[PDB]
Structure 1
Amino acid sequence: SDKTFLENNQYTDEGVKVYEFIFGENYISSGGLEATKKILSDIELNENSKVLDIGSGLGGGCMYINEKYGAHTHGIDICSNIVNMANERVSGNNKIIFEANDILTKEFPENNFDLIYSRDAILALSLENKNKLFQKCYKWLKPTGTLLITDYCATEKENWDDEFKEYVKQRKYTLITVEEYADILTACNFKNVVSKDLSDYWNQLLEVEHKYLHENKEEFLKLFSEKKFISLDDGWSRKIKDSKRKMQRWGYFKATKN
C-alpha cells in the first residue's frame, strides 16, 4: 500500500527526524516555521474557526495556526508513525487533533471548514487522486471558506533531465506544472484562484536550510550518520540547482468556495 511505502522508506521514524533537523522543530514542510508565518500572513481566522490540515506531518502547522488564531485544527496524515510523533508534542489542548487516515477515504461533513490548508503533501497523490481530493475539499469548505496550498511542482515532463526523472521516480511523486495545478482548482469550481510560482522564495528557503545543515554538521553526525548527512546535503543541493532553473518548482495556491 501507499501507507506502507511511505512509512518504510521516505518517512521511516529516522527519515522524519532527519527532515525535522533541517526544516525545524515540528516540521517536515519547506521552510518550517518561517515559511508558515509568511504563508499565513494574510489569513484571518479566530477562536471559532475550523481548520483542516491535509498532510499535517509533525504538527507544527496546526500548532502555529492554533497559537496565532485560537482556531480548531484537525490534521490528517496517512503515516501512523508521524501522527504518533505529532501527538507526543501536544498535550492538554482540546483544539488540536492529529489523525492517521487516508484523506481520500476520510469522511467530513459538507460546509465544514473555514480553512483547508496543505503544505507540500499533495505531491504524493496521482493526478487522478489530486482531482478527487480537490473535489472533496470543495465540498468540505464552508461557503465562506478558503483553500490554501503549497506543493512541489515542476516544469513540463518533456524538459526533465536524468537526475530529476530519477528523483521523481524514486519518490513516487506526481509533479505537475503550477499552471496545470491551478487548472484543477478552477475545474473543481473554486473561485478567486490565485497561483504563484514561488520557486525563487523556495530557493531562498532551501539555501537557509542548506547553510544550517552545513553549520550544524557536527551535531547532525552525532544524531545520525555521515551517510545520512551526505544524502541530505546532496538532496538539498539538487533542489537548489533545480529550483534556480525552474525544473523543480514550488507552487502556492489560494482559492475560495464563493
Structure 2
Amino acid sequence: DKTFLENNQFTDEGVKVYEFIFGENYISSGGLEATKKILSDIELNENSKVLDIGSGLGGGCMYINEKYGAHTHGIDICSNIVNMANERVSGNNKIIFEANDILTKEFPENNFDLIYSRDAILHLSLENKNKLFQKCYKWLKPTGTLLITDYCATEKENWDDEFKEYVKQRKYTLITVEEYADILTACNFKNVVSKDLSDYWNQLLEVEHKYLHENKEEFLKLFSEKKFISLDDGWSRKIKDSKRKMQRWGYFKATKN
C-alpha cells in the first residue's frame, strides 16, 4: 500500500499540488481554517501527548503544538511526505514525524491524551479500519479523546458511474457516516459523536476552488495546465457530489471512558 500511495496519489508533485490548494503544510480538507474549527473545543496542555494518524505535511501537528504546547507524534506511511514534513520543522523536540505503517506500529497502552486523524483512514479496508480503532482504544489514556474527520459516502447502491470510478482509482474504502460511528461503538468507545459535515465540507471546497481559479497564473508557473485541469475538475466533482450527499465528510469524536 505504501508503494501505491507514494507512486500515485502522493508522489512528490501530487503532494505539492495538494498543498497549493489546501494551504501551506496541509494536504487535509480545509487546511488551517478547518484545523482551527475542528480543535476549537479541544483542551490540551504542555503535558499532553498527541498522536496524529496520517500526519501528511505536518500542519496539524504544528498547529496543535503551537496552540497547546503538546507533544505531537505524527505517523504517515509515505516516506516522501514524512521527509517533507521534517523539512518544515526544526529545533522543536516536541514534534516528531515518523514514516511507518500505523497497523504494525507499537505504542504502549494508555499513552495518548488525543488521537487525531484527518482524511487518512479512507485508505484502509473495512477490516483494517476496525483493527485500527481497536488499537486506538488501547493506546488512548483513560481520559483520552479520539478525534477524526474522514471521507465518507452514501450507500454504495446509490453511487453513480463517475463516483464509482473515482473510488476505484483512489482505492478508497468509503463507508457511511453511520457505519463509521457503529465501528467506533463496537470498539467500545464512549460518548460517540458523529456529524455529517458535508455542507461545511462543501463550503471549504468552494473556498479552495475559488482560490485555485484566482491563482491560476501562479499555479501554471509552478505546475502545468494538465495538472490544473485535473485539480479543477476533481474539486468540481467533490462540490457537486457533496451538495447531493453522494460523497460525504464525516466528523467523529469519542472517549475511552
Task: State the TM bucket, normalised to the shorter chain.
Answer: over 0.9
How far the C-alpha of 1:42 sits from its partner, in A, is: 0.0
How far the C-alpha of 1:220 sits from its partner, in A, is: 0.1
In 2, the alpha carbon distance for the partners of 1:214 and 1:52 equals: 35
How far the C-alpha of 1:219 sits from its partner, in A, is: 0.1
Question: Where do 4+ consecutive residues of structure 1 move more than 3 Å?
Answer: none
In 2, the alpha carbon distance for the partners of 1:214 and 1:29 equals: 19
Superimposed CA distance per residue, residues 132-155 of structure 1 (whole angstroms, 9 cap, x where no aligned partner): 000000000000000000000000
How far the C-alpha of 1:45 sits from its partner, in A, is: 0.1
Identical amino acids, percent of aligned pairs: 99
> What is the total number of aligned residue pairs between the two structures?
257
Superimposed CA distance per residue, residues 115-169 of structure 1 (whole angstroms, 9 cap, x where no aligned partner): 0000000000000000000000000000000000000000000000000000000
How far the C-alpha of 1:69 sits from its partner, in A, is: 0.0
Superimposed CA distance per residue, residues 63-107 of structure 1 (whole angstroms, 9 cap, x where no aligned partner): 000000000000000000000000000000000000000000000
How far the C-alpha of 1:9 sits from its partner, in A, is: 0.2
In 2, the alpha carbon distance for the partners of 1:76 and 1:137 equals: 13
How far the C-alpha of 1:204 sits from its partner, in A, is: 0.1
How far the C-alpha of 1:212 sits from its partner, in A, is: 0.1
TM-score (norm 1): 1.00
In 2, the alpha carbon distance for the partners of 1:126 and 1:219 equals: 37
In 2, the alpha carbon distance for the partners of 1:111 and 1:5 equals: 32
In 2, the alpha carbon distance for the partners of 1:159 and 1:177 equals: 12
In 1, the alpha carbon distance for the partners of 2:2 and 2:253 equals: 28
In 2, the alpha carbon distance for the partners of 1:38 and 1:6 equals: 28
Question: 3-state DSSP class of the match of 1:93?
Answer: coil
Alignment map for 1:140-219 (pairs within 5 Å):
140-219=139-218
How far the C-alpha of 1:172 sits from its partner, in A, is: 0.1
Question: 3-state DSSP class of the match of 1:251?
Answer: strand
How far the C-alpha of 1:235 sits from its partner, in A, is: 0.1
Superimposed CA distance per residue, residues 174-198 of structure 1 (whole angstroms, 9 cap, x where no aligned partner): 0000000000000000000000000
In 1, the alpha carbon distance for the partners of 2:144 and 2:3 equals: 33
In 2, the alpha carbon distance for the partners of 1:129 and 1:217 equals: 39
Question: 3-state DSSP class of the match of 1:99?
Answer: strand
How far the C-alpha of 1:210 sits from its partner, in A, is: 0.1
In 1, the alpha carbon distance for the partners of 2:216 and 2:117 equals: 30
Alignment map for 1:98-137 (pairs within 5 Å):
98-137=97-136
Question: 3-state DSSP class of the match of 1:64?
Answer: helix
How far the C-alpha of 1:253 sits from its partner, in A, is: 0.0
How far the C-alpha of 1:39 sits from its partner, in A, is: 0.0
Structure 1 residues without counterparts, runs of 5 or longer: none
Question: 3-state DSSP class of the match of 1:143?
Answer: strand
How far the C-alpha of 1:249 sits from its partner, in A, is: 0.1
In 2, the alpha carbon distance for the partners of 1:205 and 1:128 equals: 30
